[PDB]
Amino acid sequence: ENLKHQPGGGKVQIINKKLDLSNVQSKCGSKDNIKHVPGGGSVQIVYKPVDLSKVTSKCGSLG
Amino acid sequence: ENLKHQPGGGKVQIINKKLDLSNVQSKCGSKDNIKHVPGGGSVQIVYKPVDLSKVTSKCGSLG
Amino acid sequence: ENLKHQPGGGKVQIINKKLDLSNVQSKCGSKDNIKHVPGGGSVQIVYKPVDLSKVTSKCGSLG
Amino acid sequence: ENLKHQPGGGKVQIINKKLDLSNVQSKCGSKDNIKHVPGGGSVQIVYKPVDLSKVTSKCGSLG
Amino acid sequence: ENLKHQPGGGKVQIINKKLDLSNVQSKCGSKDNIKHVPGGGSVQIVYKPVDLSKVTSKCGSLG
Amino acid sequence: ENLKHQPGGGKVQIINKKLDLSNVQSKCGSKDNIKHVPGGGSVQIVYKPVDLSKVTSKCGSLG
Amino acid sequence: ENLKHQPGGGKVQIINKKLDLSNVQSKCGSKDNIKHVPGGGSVQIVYKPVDLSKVTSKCGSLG
Amino acid sequence: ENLKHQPGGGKVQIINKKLDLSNVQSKCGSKDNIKHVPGGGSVQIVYKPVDLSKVTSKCGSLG
Amino acid sequence: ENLKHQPGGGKVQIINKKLDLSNVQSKCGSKDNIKHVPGGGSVQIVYKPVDLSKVTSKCGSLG
Amino acid sequence: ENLKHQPGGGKVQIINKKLDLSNVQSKCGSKDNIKHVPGGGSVQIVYKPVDLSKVTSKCGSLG
Numbered sequence: 001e002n003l004k005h006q007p008g009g010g011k012v013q014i015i016n017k018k019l020d021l022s023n024v025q026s027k028c029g030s031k032d033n034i035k036h037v038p039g040g041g042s043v044q045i046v047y048k049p050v051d052l053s054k055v056t057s058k059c060g061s062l063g
Numbered sequence: 064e065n066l067k068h069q070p071g072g073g074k075v076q077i078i079n080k081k082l083d084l085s086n087v088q089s090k091c092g093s094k095d096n097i098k099h100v101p102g103g104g105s106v107q108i109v110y111k112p113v114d115l116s117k118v119t120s121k122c123g124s125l126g
Numbered sequence: 127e128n129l130k131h132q133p134g135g136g137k138v139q140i141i142n143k144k145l146d147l148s149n150v151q152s153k154c155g156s157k158d159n160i161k162h163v164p165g166g167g168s169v170q171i172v173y174k175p176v177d178l179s180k181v182t183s184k185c186g187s188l189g
Numbered sequence: 190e191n192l193k194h195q196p197g198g199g200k201v202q203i204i205n206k207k208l209d210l211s212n213v214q215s216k217c218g219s220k221d222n223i224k225h226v227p228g229g230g231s232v233q234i235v236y237k238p239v240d241l242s243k244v245t246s247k248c249g250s251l252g
Numbered sequence: 253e254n255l256k257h258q259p260g261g262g263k264v265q266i267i268n269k270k271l272d273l274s275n276v277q278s279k280c281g282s283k284d285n286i287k288h289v290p291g292g293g294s295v296q297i298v299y300k301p302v303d304l305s306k307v308t309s310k311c312g313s314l315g
Numbered sequence: 316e317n318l319k320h321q322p323g324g325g326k327v328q329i330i331n332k333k334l335d336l337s338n339v340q341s342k343c344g345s346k347d348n349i350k351h352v353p354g355g356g357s358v359q360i361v362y363k364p365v366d367l368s369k370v371t372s373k374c375g376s377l378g
Numbered sequence: 379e380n381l382k383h384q385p386g387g388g389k390v391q392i393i394n395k396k397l398d399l400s401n402v403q404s405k406c407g408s409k410d411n412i413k414h415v416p417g418g419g420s421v422q423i424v425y426k427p428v429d430l431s432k433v434t435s436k437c438g439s440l441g
Numbered sequence: 442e443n444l445k446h447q448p449g450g451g452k453v454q455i456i457n458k459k460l461d462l463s464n465v466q467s468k469c470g471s472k473d474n475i476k477h478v479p480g481g482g483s484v485q486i487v488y489k490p491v492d493l494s495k496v497t498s499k500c501g502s503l504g
Numbered sequence: 505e506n507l508k509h510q511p512g513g514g515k516v517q518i519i520n521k522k523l524d525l526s527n528v529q530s531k532c533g534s535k536d537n538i539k540h541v542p543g544g545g546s547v548q549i550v551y552k553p554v555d556l557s558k559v560t561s562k563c564g565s566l567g
Numbered sequence: 568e569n570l571k572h573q574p575g576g577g578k579v580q581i582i583n584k585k586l587d588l589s590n591v592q593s594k595c596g597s598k599d600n601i602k603h604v605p606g607g608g609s610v611q612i613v614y615k616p617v618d619l620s621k622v623t624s625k626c627g628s629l630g
Contacts (some may be wrong), residue, residue, distance in 0.1 A: 028217035218278035533593035
């Protein structure tokens with residue numbers, strides 16, 4: 001079915017991966033006020049500032 | 064079915080990947096006020112400032 | 127079915143990928159006020175400023 | 190089925206992976222107030238600032 | 253089925269992995285107040301600032 | 316004599332210097348033959364291919 | 379004589395210097411033959427291929 | 442004579458110096474033949490391939 | 505004579521110096537033949553391939 | 568004469584010096600033949616391949 005399957009014929013190979021990830025933040029910081037009082041039937045979710053530069057995920061189910 | 068399957072014939076190969084990711088933020092920071100009081104049947108969701116420079120995901124189900 | 131399947135015949139190959147991603151932000155920051163009081167049947171969603179420079183996603187189901 | 194299965198023919202190979210991950214934070218820090226009083230049937234979740242530079246995950250079920 | 257299974261023919265190979273992970277924090281620290289009083293049927297969860305530079309996970313079930 | 320001497324009044328300044336210097340060479344290389352046999356009173360000088368992309372020189376005497 | 383001497387009044391300054399210096403060479407290499415036989419009164423000088431990307435020199439006497 | 446002498450008034454300053462110096466060589470190498478036989482009054486000098494990426498010299502006398 | 509002498513007033517300063525020095529060589533190597541037979545009054549000098557990436561010299565006399 | 572002499576007023580300072588020095592060599596090695604037979608009045612000097620990545624010299628006399 002597959003004899004070579006993508007053969008790579010070379011002699012000299014030089015690669016330089018330059019990954020410059022610069023994440024700046026707020027020196028003063030953030031300020032938020034949230035109020036939650038269960039009584040009926042509702043959903044509430046609050047997340048704080050997060051830093052996502054790089055991530056490696058091949059396969060994931062329900063994050 | 065596949066003999067070579069995309070053959071690469073070369074002698075000298077030099078590649079330089081330059082990834083310049085510069086993410087700036089608000090030195091003063093952000094300010095937001097949210098109010099939530101369960102009683103009926105509604106949905107509420109609040110997220111804070113996030114930084115997404117680069118991400119590698121081959122396959123993902125329900126994020 | 128496929129003998130070569132896109133053959134690449136060369137001797138010298140030099141490539142330089144220049145990715146200049148500059149994301150500026152508001153030094154003063156943003157300010158927004160949201161009010162939510164469950165009682166009937168409605169949906170509400172609030173997101174904060176996010177920075178999306180680059181993203182790599184081959185396949186994704188329901189984000 | 191597979192004879193070579195992606196053969197790599199070379200003589201000299203030099204690669205330099207440069208991963209520059211710079212995560213800045215808020216010297217002043219963040220300030221948020223959350224109120225929760227169980228009584229009805231609602232869901233509430235609060236997360237604090239997190240730093241995600243790099244992550245390696247091949248397979249994951251329910252995170 | 254597999255004779256070579258991805259053969260690697262070379263003479264000299266030099267690789268230098270440069271992983272620069274810099275995680276900054278808030279010298280001033282964060283301040284948050286949460287209130288929880290069980291009485292009805294709701295769920296509440298609070299997490300403190302965490303630092304995630306790198307992680308190696310091949311397979312995981314329910315984290 | 317000088318009070319301000321070129322004052323710079325601003326609030327926000329963002330500059331991005333992009334210096335793309337690409338120097339190509341002759342994969343085949345050069346070939347030159349020179350003959351010199353001292354006997355009289357003459358001067359001879361031979362230089363090989365050089366690459367000059369950028370140079371910073373404030374002051375120089377006799378190069 | 380000088381009170382301020384070029385004052386710089388600002389609040390936020392972000393600069394990104396991008397220096398991309400790519401110097402290619404001759405994979406085949408160069409070939410030159412030089413002959414020198416002292417007998418009279420002459421001067422001879424031979425230099426080989428050199429790579430000059432960047433140089434920082436404030437002051438120099440006789441190089 | 443000098444009161445301030447170039448004062449710098451700021452609040453937030455972020456600079457990222459990107460120095461990409463790529464020096465390629467001749468995998469095949471160079472080949473040169475030189476002949477020198479003292480007998481008269483001449484000067485001869487031969488140098489081999491050198492790589493000059495960057496150099497820092499404030500002051501130098503006779504190099 | 506000098507009161508401040510270049511004063512620096514700031515609050516937050518983040519700098520990232522990226523020095524990428526890549527020096528390639530000739531896997532095959534170089535080959536040169538030199539002949540010297542003292543008899544008259546001449547000067548001869550031969551140097552081999554050298555690698556100069558970076559150098560720090562404030563002051564130097566006769567190198 | 569000097570009161571402050573270059574005062575530095577700040578609160579938070581984060582610097583990351585990245586010095587990537589990669590020096591490659593010739594796996595095959597070099598080959599050179601030199602002949603010297605004193606008889607007259609000449610000077611001869613031969614040096615072998617050297618690697619100079621970085622050097623720190625404030626002051627030097629006759630190197």
